[PDB]
From a paper:
Fortunately, we could study all compounds generated in this iterative step through cocrystal structures in complex with the hTBD homolog MsCI4.44 These data confirmed that the preferred orientation of the ortho substituent toward the amide NH was preserved in the bound state of all ligands except for 11b. The results, therefore, strongly suggest that IMHBs predetermine the ligand conformation in solution.
Nowadays, the E3 ligase substrate receptor cereblon (CRBN), thalidomide’s primary target, is of particular importance in the fields of MGs and PROTACs. However, these CRBN ligands induce the degradation of IMiD neosubstrates and are inherently unstable, degrading hydrolytically under moderate conditions. In this work, we simultaneously optimized physiochemical properties, stability, on-target affinity, and off-target neosubstrate modulation features to develop novel nonphthalimide CRBN binders. These efforts led to the discovery of conformationally locked benzamide-type derivatives that replicate the interactions of the natural CRBN degron, exhibit enhanced chemical stability, and display a favorable selectivity profile in terms of neosubstrate recruitment.
Numbering used by the authors:
A (entry chain A): 20 to 123
B (entry chain C): 18 to 38, 45 to 52, 56 to 123
C (entry chain B): 19 to 123
The structure:
Amino acid sequence: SIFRCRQCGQTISRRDWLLPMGGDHEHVVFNPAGMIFRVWCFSLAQGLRLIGAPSGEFSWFKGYDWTIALCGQCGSHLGWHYEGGSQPQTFFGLIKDRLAEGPA
Amino acid sequence: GASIFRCRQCGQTISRRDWLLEHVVFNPAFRVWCFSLAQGLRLIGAPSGEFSWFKGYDWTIALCGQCGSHLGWHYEGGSQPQTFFGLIKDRLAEGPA
Amino acid sequence: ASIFRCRQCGQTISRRDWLLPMGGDHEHVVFNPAGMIFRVWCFSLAQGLRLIGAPSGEFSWFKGYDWTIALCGQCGSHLGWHYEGGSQPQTFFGLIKDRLAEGPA
Ligand SMILES: COc1c(N)c(F)cc(C(=O)N[C@H]2CCC(=O)NC2=O)c1F
Ligand SMILES: COc1c(N)c(F)cc(C(=O)N[C@H]2CCC(=O)NC2=O)c1F
Ligand SMILES: [Zn+2]
Ligand SMILES: [Zn+2]
Ligand SMILES: [Zn+2]
């Protein structure tokens, strides 16, 4: 039921907050450095630090601008916060294998 | 971020947005993208008409030629166009050019 | 052609053919109530383990299943857990990937 940072245990999200974007909470994507990510979309997250200013370049999600989301505790790259869009205006795409799932 | 399509499992290049030709379908128990062209698949078996979602086309199984994952089907025997590829959205990764 | 062996003693435990995508993936990163973090791979079957204890539903990572601790039957290394009492499948194993060694049949 709760998602923590796999590296340090920082509280990040919850299964209840998963968000099916275009029909599915899970999206498999690659960046221009050819890294493949299994991204889980969440309506809400906490315990992150969002770094820099949003950018629309290479956005996987139509109409959204992204900011890099680090673990606020350990600094590990956990995914991205998306904004600037519609329905919803904002959400988080977190890298599923950087999280640890467990009891509430 | 979404002009090239690759195998989800291993990252083999399969197709591109320029070749798109999102059908939601039900097998007899998918969000399929149709493409005019693809690469890096291996098409296996003999074409079959059984439960073909596309009227007048027979299908052949399309595997990723790099790792063997099942990515969708190749359709032949129809008209306008004669042939195309129907790939399973959830088996692809999307990314930049 | 791939089997998983106990990393400590070499006993054959499971097969790659038996990898099971529970909730969409065979790999789950999980944490127990003492905050220990494990990277678990799900298999339908296994062999050469010894399940200890009565099944328990408390804190199960997989809803609708009870768990029992699974040790290597040969050397006693803690390799994961067995799950039972659910449906489709009724039972399966969550094994600690870092405590296995994968290799040819
Ligand atoms: C700006 O060039 C880069 C470089 N050079 C990079 F090394 C990595 C990225 C990167 O991971 N971007 C993600 C951000 C989130 C999104 O939705 N799509 C992406 O593709 C990137 F954009
Ligand atoms: C009963 O309190 C404990 C203590 N004290 C412990 F030190 C470890 C565990 C433990 O590892 N539990 C696993 C069992 C397998 C599963 O699916 N979920 C878990 O959370 C545990 F439950
Ligand atoms: Zn962290
Ligand atoms: Zn592949
Ligand atoms: Zn052993």
